[PDB]
Amino acid sequence: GLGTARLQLVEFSAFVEPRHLFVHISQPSPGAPPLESVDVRQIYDKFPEKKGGLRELYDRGPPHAFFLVKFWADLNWGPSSGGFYGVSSQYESLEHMTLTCSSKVCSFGKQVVEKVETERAQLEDGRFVYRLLRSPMCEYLVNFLHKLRQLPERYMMNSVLENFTILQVVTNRDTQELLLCTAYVFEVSTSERGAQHHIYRLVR
Ligand SMILES: *C(=O)CCCCCCCCCCCCC
User: Fold this and answer.
1) Which ligand 1 atom is at minimum distance from the Cα of 164?
2) Structural contact between residues 197 and 25, judged by C-beta atoms closer than 8 angstroms
3) Cα of 130 vs its chain's centroid, Å
4) Fewer Cβ atoms within 10 A, N terminus or C terminus of the chain?
5) Is the CB of 103 under 6 A from ligand 1?
């Protein structure tokens, strides 16, 4: 699903503990179609046209490394204020690498946060795992979430979320090769339905 032959996302979650998951991707399924495709041009405007913009990134390639994730987030938690707010990601590969993971939080197409982490490979069960667990969510997101959950209707959450996107670029720190680039877009789910996602391939 979300992965190349060089690097596969295994698990992704954003969550709060006093554990509630806002979003969750866990990664095998028989019959399962290939991923649908979205024209990358439809979303150039969700991220900045600057350097590290989607167009420029996609221009360098390779194109099979580019995915769109639509999240229907679950923002229904509490009996709250405080809590630990975290993001956990797990990647895996057959090759030994060091990773640079850049996340760019974007509001109306403008970058308001860039977070850069590094993770070195760890051998486990005959492959390399890259575990970036319990990374503290930046304060911008935490405040944003705190406000977003006060909104009295889900349609109003959706209207606010239509201007909020995240771009993640994962590169091979040594060679500077793009390994994975994921654009994320957001709506809200009900707590009854729970969080969901749909992964697409970006093409051009
Ligand atoms: C940390 O500060 C940035 C890490 C980048 C990924 C954040 C994604 C998680 C946000 C969940 C939002 C839920 C709906 C708006």
Assistant:
1) 15
2) yes
3) 15
4) C
5) yes
